[PDB]
Amino acid sequence: TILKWLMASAGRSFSTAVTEQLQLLPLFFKIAPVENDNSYDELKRDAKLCLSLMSQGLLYPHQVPLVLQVLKQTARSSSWHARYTVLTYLQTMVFYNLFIFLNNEDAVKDIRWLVISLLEDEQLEVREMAATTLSGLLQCNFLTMDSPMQIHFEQLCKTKLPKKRKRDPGSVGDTIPSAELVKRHAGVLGLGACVLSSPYDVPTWMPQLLMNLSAHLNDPQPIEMTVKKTLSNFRRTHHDNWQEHKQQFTDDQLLVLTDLLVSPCYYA
Amino acid sequence: MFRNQYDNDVTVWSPQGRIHQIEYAMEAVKQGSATVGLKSKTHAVLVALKRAQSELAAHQKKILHVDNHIGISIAGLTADARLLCNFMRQECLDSRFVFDRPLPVSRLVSLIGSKTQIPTQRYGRRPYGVGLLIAGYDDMGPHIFQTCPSANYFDCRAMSIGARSQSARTYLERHMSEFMECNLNELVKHGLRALRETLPAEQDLTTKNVSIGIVGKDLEFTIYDDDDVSPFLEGLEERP
Amino acid sequence: RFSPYVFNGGTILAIAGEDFAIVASDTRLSEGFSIHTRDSPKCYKLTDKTVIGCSGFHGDCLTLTKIIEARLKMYKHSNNKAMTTGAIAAMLSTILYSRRFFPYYVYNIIGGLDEEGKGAVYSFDPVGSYQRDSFKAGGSASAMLQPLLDNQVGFKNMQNVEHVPLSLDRAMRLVKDVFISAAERDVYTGDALRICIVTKEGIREETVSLRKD
Amino acid sequence: VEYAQEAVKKGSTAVGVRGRDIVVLGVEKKSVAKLQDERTVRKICALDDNVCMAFAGLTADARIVINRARVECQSHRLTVEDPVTVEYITRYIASLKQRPFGISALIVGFDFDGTPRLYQTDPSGTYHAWKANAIGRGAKSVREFLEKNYTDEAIETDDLTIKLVIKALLEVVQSGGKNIELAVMRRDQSLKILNPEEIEKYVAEIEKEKEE
Amino acid sequence: MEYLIGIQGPDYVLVASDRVAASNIVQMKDDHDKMFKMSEKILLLCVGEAGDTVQFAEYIQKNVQLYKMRNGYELSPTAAANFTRRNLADCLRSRTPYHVNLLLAGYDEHEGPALYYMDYLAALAKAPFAAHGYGAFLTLSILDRYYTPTISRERAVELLRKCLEELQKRFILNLPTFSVRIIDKNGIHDLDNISF
Amino acid sequence: LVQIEYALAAVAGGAPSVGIKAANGVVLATEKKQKSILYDERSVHKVEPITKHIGLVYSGMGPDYRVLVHRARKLAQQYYLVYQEPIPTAQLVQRVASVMQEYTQSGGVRPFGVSLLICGWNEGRPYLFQSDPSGAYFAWKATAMGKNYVNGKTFLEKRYNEDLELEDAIHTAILTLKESFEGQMTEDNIEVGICNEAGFRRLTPTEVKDYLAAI
Amino acid sequence: MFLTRSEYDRGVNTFSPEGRLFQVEYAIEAIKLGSTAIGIQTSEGVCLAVEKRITSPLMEPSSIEKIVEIDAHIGCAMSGLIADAKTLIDKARVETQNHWFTYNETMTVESVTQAVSNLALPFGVALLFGGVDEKGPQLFHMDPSGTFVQCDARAIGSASEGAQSSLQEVYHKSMTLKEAIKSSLIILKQVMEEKLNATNIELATVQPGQNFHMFTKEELEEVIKDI
Amino acid sequence: AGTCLGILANDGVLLAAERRNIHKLLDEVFFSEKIYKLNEDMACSVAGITSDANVLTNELRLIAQRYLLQYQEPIPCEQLVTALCDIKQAYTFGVSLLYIGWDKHYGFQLYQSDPSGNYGGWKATCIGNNSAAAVSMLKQDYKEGEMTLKSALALAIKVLNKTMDVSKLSAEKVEIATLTRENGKTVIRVLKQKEVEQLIKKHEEEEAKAER
Amino acid sequence: TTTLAFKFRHGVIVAADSRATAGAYIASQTVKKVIEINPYLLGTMAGGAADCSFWERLLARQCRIYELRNKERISVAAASKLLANMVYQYKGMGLSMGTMICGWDKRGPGLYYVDSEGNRISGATFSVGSGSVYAYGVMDRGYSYDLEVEQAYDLARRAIYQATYRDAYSGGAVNLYHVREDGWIRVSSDNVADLHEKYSG
The CATH classification number of D1-212 equals 3.60.20.10
DSSP state of G138: E
Q: Write down the domain spans for chain D.
A: 1-212
Kindly report the backbone phi and psi dihedral angles of residue A15, in degrees, each rounded to the nearest multiple of 5, phi listed first. Answer: -115, 90
Inter-chain residue contact B164 with A265, CB threshold 8 Å: no
Q: Are A256 and A211 in contact (CB under 8 A)?
A: yes
Alpha-carbon distance D179 to D203, whole Å?
11
Phi, psi of F150 (to 5 degrees): -60, -50
Q: How many domains does chain I have?
A: 1
**CB–CB contact E26 I136 (8 Å):** yes
Answer yes or no: are the C-beta atoms of A71 and A90 closer than 8 Å.
Answer: yes
Q: Provide the 3-class DSSP secondary structure of residue B69.
A: coil
Alpha carbons I45 and I132: distance in angstroms, whole number: 12
User: For position E157, which CATH number holds?
Assistant: 3.60.20.10
CATH number at residue I88: 3.60.20.10
Are I57 and G101 in contact (CB < 8 Å)? yes
For helices I132-142 and I149-166, the axis angle rounded to 10 degrees is 150
Domains in chain E, number:
1
Question: For residue I105, what are the CA distances in angstroms to D19, H11, H46?
Answer: 25, 58, 58
Q: How far is CA E152 from the centre of its chain?
A: 19
Angle, helices F89-105 vs H50-71, to 10°: value is: 100
Q: Which of A122, A166, A174 to mutate to test the interface with G (most CBs of G within 10 A)?
A: A174
Residues of chain E in contact with residue H71, where contact means CB-CB under 8 angstroms, are: 75, 79, 82-83, 86
**Is I81's CB within 8 Å of D87's CB?**
no
| Residue in C97, C131, C143 closest to I54 by CB | C97
Strand E194-195 and strand E26-29: the pairing is unpaired
Q: How far, CA to CA in Å, does B121 sit from each of B26, B82, B150, G18? A: 15, 21, 11, 21
d(Cα E17, Cα E2) in Å, to the nearest integer? 8
Domain boundaries, chain H: 3-211
- Contact partners, residue I48, CB within 8 Å, separation at least 6: C127, C129, I95, I96, I97
Q: How far is CA B79 from CA C76, F41, G118, in A?
A: 20, 65, 9
Chain G closest-CA separation from residue C23 CA (Å): 22
Subunit contact A222:G159, Cβ cutoff 8 A? no
The topology (CATH level 3) of H3-211 is Glutamine Phosphoribosylpyrophosphate, subunit 1, domain 1 (3.60.20)
Chain B contacts of G149, Cβ < 8 Å? Answer: 52-53, 57-60
Do C and A have ≥3 inter-chain CB pairs under 8 A? no
Cα separation, F19 vs D67, in Å, equals 51
C-alpha A89 chain-centroid distance: 12
CA atoms within 13 A on the CB side of H105: 15
Pairs from E24-32 (Cβ < 8 Å, separation ≥ 24)? E25/I133, E26/I132, E26/I133, E26/I136, E27/E174, E28/I113, E28/I119, E28/I121, E28/I123, E28/I126, E29/I113, E29/I121, E29/I122, E29/I123, E30/E176, E30/E177, E31/E177, E32/I121
Using the beta-carbon criterion (under 8 Å), do C74 and B93 form an inter-chain contact? Answer: yes
Q: Name which of G17, G121, G168 is nearest B56 (Cβ-Cβ).
A: G168
Q: What is the CATH number of the domain that holds C19?
A: 3.60.20.10
Cβ within 8 Å, pair G83-D124: yes
Q: How far apart are the first and last CA of chain H?
A: 36
Strand, helix or coil for residue G75: strand
- Interchain contact G138–C (C-beta under 8 A): no
A6 closest CA partner among A57, A27, A30, A17: A17
- Verify whether the Cβ–Cβ distance I49 to C125 is below 8 Å: yes
d(CA D165, CA D147): 13
* Whole-angstrom distance, CA of residue F53 vs CA of residue F89: 8
Give the whole-angstrom CA distance, residue C181 versus residue A24.
100
Q: Over the range C14-38, which residues count as b (16 or more CB within 10 Å of their CB) and which as e?
A: bbbbeebbbbbbbbbbbeeeebeee
- CB-count burial class (<10 Å; 0-12, 13-18, 19+) for A193: buried
Task: Give chain I positions within 8 Å (CB) of E26.
Answer: 132-133, 136
Contact status, residue E136 vs residue E175, Cβ threshold 8 Å: no
Residue A220 is classified by DSSP as P
Judged by CB atoms closer than 8 Å, whether chains meet at A259 and B78 is answered as no
Question: What architecture does CATH give domain F1-215?
Answer: 4-Layer Sandwich (3.60)
Q: Which residues contact C33 (CB under 8 A, 6 or more apart)?
A: none
User: Hey, is H9 helix, strand or coil?
Assistant: coil
Q: Are H45 and H34 in contact (CB under 8 A)?
A: yes
DSSP secondary structure letter of residue H74: P
Q: Distance (Å, rounded) from C-alpha I145 to C-alpha E43?
A: 32
**D59 CB contacts (<8 Å, ≥6 apart)?**
D41, D43, H118
Q: Does the beta carbon of A244 lie under 8 angstroms from any beta carbon of chain B?
A: no
Contact B59, B209 (CB under 8 A): yes
- What is the C-alpha end-to-end distance of chain G, expressed in Å? 38
> How many whole angstroms separate alpha carbon C68 and alpha carbon C74?
10
Q: What angle do CA C141, C146, C149 make, to 5 degrees?
A: 130
G222 lies within 8 A of chain C by CB: no
B119: preceding bond cis by omega (within 30 degrees): no
Residue F48, Ramachandran bin (φ over 0: left; ψ between -120 and 50: alpha; else beta): beta
Long-range pairs, B220-225, Cβ under 8 A, ≥24 = B220/B68, B220/B69, B221/B65, B221/B66, B221/B67, B221/B68, B221/B69, B221/B70, B221/B71, B221/B135, B221/B137, B223/B63, B223/B65, B223/B71
Residue B77 is given by DSSP the state B
- How many Å apart are CA E9 and CA E185, to the nearest integer? 12
Which residues constitute the domain of residue C43?
1-213
- Per the entry, the structure determination technique was cryo-EM
- Please state, in angstroms and rounded to a whole number, the distance separating the CA atoms of residues D33 and B217: 88
Q: E136: which residues sit within 8 A by CB, 6+ positions away? A: E3, E4, E5
Burial of A214 (0-12, 13-18, 19+ CB in 10 A): middle
Name all domains of chain B by residue range, CATH numbers in brackets. 1-240 (3.60.20.10)
Residue to mutate among C107, C129, C142, with most I CBs inside 10 A, is C129
CB contact under 8 Å between D82 and I75, yes or no, is yes
CA-to-CA distance for F35 and I161, rounded, in angstroms? 105
Rounded Cα gap, residues I47 and I60, in angstroms:
19
Interface test with chain A among B31, B50, B73, by most A beta carbons within 10 Å: B31
Pairwise CA distance, residues C147 & C140, whole Å = 14
**Which among F12, H135, G71, E164 is positioned nearest to I68, based on CA atoms?**
G71
Contacts of B100 (CB under 8 A, 6+ apart): C66
The whole-angstrom separation of Cα F35 and Cα E135 is 90
What residues of A are in contact with residue B79 (Cβ under 8 Å)?
266
Report the Cα–Cα distance between both ends of chain I, in Å, rounded. Answer: 25
Chains that touch H (3 or more CB pairs under 8 A): D, E, F
Residues of C in contact with I28 (CB under 8 A): 123, 131, 133
Determine phi and psi for B229, rounding to 5 degrees.
Answer: -85, -5
**Sheet (strand C21-26) strand order:** C135-139, C11-16, C21-26, C193-198, C203-208
CA G115/CA A247 separation, integer angstroms: 49
Closest residue by Cα to residue G47 from G207, G223, G218: G207
**DSSP H or E stretch at residue A229:** helix A223-235
Chain B contacts to A (CB-CB under 8 A): 1-3, 28, 30-33, 50-51, 53-55, 60, 62, 74-79, 162-164, 200, 202-203
Q: Which residues in G lie closer than 8 A to residue A77 (C-beta atoms)?
A: none
Out of I1, I3, I99, I125, the active site residue is: I1
Contact I65 G69 (CB under 8 A): no
C101 has a chain I CB within 8 A of its CB:
yes
Q: Which domains does chain G have, with CATH numbers?
A: 1-227 (3.60.20.10)
| D55 DSSP β-pair partners | D105
**Long-range CB contacts for residues B149-152, cutoff 8 Å, separation at least 24:** B149/B22, B149/B25, B149/B26, B149/B28, B149/B29, B149/B76, B149/B116, B150/B22, B150/B23, B150/B25, B150/B26, B150/B120, B151/B113, B151/B114, B151/B116, B151/B117, B151/B120, B151/B127, B152/B113
Determine how many CB atoms are found less than 10 A away from the CB of residue H176.
Answer: 24
Measured CA to CA, the distance from residue G205 to residue G151 in angstroms comes to: 16
What is the identity of the amino acid at D23?
V
CB contacts of C77 in chain B (<8 Å) are 65, 89
Question: Phi and psi dihedrals of G154, rounded to 5?
Answer: -155, 135
- B146 touches B139 (CB < 8 A): no
Backbone dihedral angles phi then psi of residue F6, each to the nearest 5 degrees:
-75, -25
Interface residue F175 vs chain H (CB under 8 A)? no
Q: Which of B27, B54, B83 sits opposite G18 (nearest CB)?
A: B27
Interface mutation target, options G99, G101, G102, chain C, most CBs of C under 10 Å: G102
Strand partners, D135: D14
Question: A176: which chain G residues are within 8 Å (Cβ-Cβ)?
Answer: 166, 169
**DSSP collapsed to 3 states, E169-189:** HHCCCCCCEEEEEEEECCEEE
Q: Residue B29's closest CA among A267, G11, A256?
A: A267
Q: SS3 for chain F, per residue?
A: CHHHHHHHHHHHCCCCEEEEECCCCEEEEEECCCCCCCCCCCCCCCCEECCCCEEEEEEECHHHHHHHHHHHHHHHHHHHHHHCCCCCHHHHHHHHHHHHHHHHHCCCCCCCCEEEEEEEECCCCEEEEEECCCCCEEECCEEEECCCHHHHHHHHHHHCCCCCCHHHHHHHHHHHHHCCCCCCCCCCCEEEEEEECCEEEECCHHHHHHHHHCC
Eight-class DSSP state of D12: P
Distance separating alpha carbons of residues G92 and G76, to the nearest angstrom = 10
Q: How far apart are CA C138 and CA C128, in angstroms?
A: 14
Does B contact H via 3+ CB–CB distances below 8 Å?
Answer: no
Q: Write down how long chain G is.
A: 227
| Bridge partner list, C72 | none
From CA I17, how far away is CA I163, in angstroms rounded?
Answer: 9
- Dist. CA C208–CA C203, nearest whole Å: 17
- C157 in Cβ contact with C116 (< 8 Å): no
Nearest Cα residue in chain I from E32: I121
Exposure string over I123-135, b if 16+ CB within 10 A, otherwise e: bbbbbbbbbbbbb
Q: What is the distance of C-alpha A84 from the center of its chain?
A: 9
Contacts of G64 in chain I (CB under 8 A): none
Q: What are phi and psi of G131, to 5 degrees?
A: -170, 180
Name the nearest CA neighbour of C72 among C100, C104, C96, C50. C50
Task: Judge whether C127 is closer than 8 Å to chain I, CB to CB.
Answer: yes
| CB-based contact G49:G203 (threshold 8 Å) | yes
Cα→Cα distances I33→G99, G103, I16, I17, I43, Å: 24, 20, 6, 7, 8
List the beta strands (DSSP E) in H58-184: 97-103, 107-113, 119-122, 124-128, 174-182
Comparing CB atoms, the residue among D95, D125, D128 nearest residue G59 is: D128
Strand order in the sheet with F190-196: F142-145, F17-21, F26-31, F190-196, F199-202
Closest residue, chain F, to H25 (C-alpha): F141
Cβ count near A158 (within 10 Å): 10
Structural domain of E22: 1-196
Q: Binding site for bortezomib, residues of I?
A: 49
Give me the residue from D70, D75, D78 closest to E69, CB to CB. Answer: D70
| B77 with A266: Cβ contact below 8 A | yes
In chain I, which residues have their Cβ closer than 8 Å to the Cβ of E54? Answer: 84, 118, 120
Spatial distance between the Cα atoms of H99 and H81, rounded to a whole number of angstroms: 8
Residue I181, classified by CB atoms within 10 Å of its CB into exposed (0-12), middle (13-18) or buried (19+), is exposed
Note whether G touches H: 3 CB pairs or more under 8 A: no
- CA neighbours within 13 Å on the CB side: how many for E14? 25
Torsion of CA I89, I92, I98, I104, to 10 degrees: 20
Query: For residue D184, how far is the Cα from the chain centroid?
Result: 9
Q: Nearest by CB to H25, which of F101, F134, F140?
A: F140
d(CA G94, CA F54): 63
Question: String of b and e for D98-112 (b: at least 16 CB within 10 Å)?
Answer: eebbbbbbbbbbbbb
Closest of B159, B234, B143 to residue B195, by C-alpha: B159
- Answer yes or no: I1 catalytic: yes
Secondary structure element (H or E) that encloses residue G28, with its range:
helix G22-28
